[PDB]
């Protein structure tokens, strides 16, 4: 894989409960991908054209804790499992992929970069099988073309007896379809 990644934590379990309740986060923001938490689960958000995109089944209808207080969702599509908030200052906006390269790369919450073979518009095969538990918490994470552009975000895993052989994702196209119906 050409692409690499590392993570940096910003908050602990306590300051997260606090920030959750005040909706106000002073921490400086960086990175293409944000690691997000509610009370009951963790997941990922990918910034693309100034919107922080993630899944509904992680974020629900919630606000994002921000510097000027809670940020209201700018896009909400329950049935796509997609939501987006305006990207906080300093998040690194990613660029959409359109060249349609066949081999993709999933970035997990562990900052691992996993080879995927595109099988269709919103489906991708894992060249190498992984535990479901290993992917759990990476919904919202980006699938990248080899150039580092974003093709989609991770939505669900195709799996059997706790082993995942494929990923279902929201193609960067659907993020247009929600924006138009705004």
């Amino acid at each position: 894989a050409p692409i690499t990644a590392y993570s940096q934590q910003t908050r602990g379990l306590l300051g997260c409960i606090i920030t959750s309740l005040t909706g106000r986060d002073k921490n400086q923001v960086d990175g293409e991908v944000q690691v997000l938490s509610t009370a009951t689960q963790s997941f990922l958000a990918t910034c693309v054209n100034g919107v922080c995109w993630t899944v509904y089944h992680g974020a629900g209808s919630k606000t994002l804790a921000g510097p000027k207080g809670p940020i209201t969702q700018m896009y909400t599509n329950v049935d796509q499992d997609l939501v987006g908030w305006p990207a906080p200052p300093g998040a690194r906006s990613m660029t959409p992929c359109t060249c349609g390269s066949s081999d993709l790369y999933l970035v997990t919450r562990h900052a691992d970069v996993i080879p995927v073979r595109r099988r269709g518009d919103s489906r991708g095969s894992l060249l190498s099988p992984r535990p479901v538990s290993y992917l759990k918490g990476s919904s919202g994470g980006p699938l990248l073309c080899p150039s580092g552009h974003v093709v989609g975000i991770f939505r669900a895993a195709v799996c059997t007896r706790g082993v995942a052989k494929a990923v279902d994702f929201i193609p960067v196209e659907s993020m247009e379809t929600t924006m138009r119906a705004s």
Binding site: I3, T4, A5, Y6, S7, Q8, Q9, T10, R11, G12, C16, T19, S20, L21, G23, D25, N27, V29, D30, G31, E32, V33, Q34, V35, L36, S37, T38, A39, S42, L44, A59, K62, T63, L64, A65, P70, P88, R92, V107, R109, A111, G148
Partner: peptide
């Protein structure tokens, strides 16, 4: 009622 919180980030190269 609780807002979602950024607890970390991932840097890409």
């Amino acid at each position: 009622k609780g807002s979602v919180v950024i607890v970390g980030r991932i840097i890409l190269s």
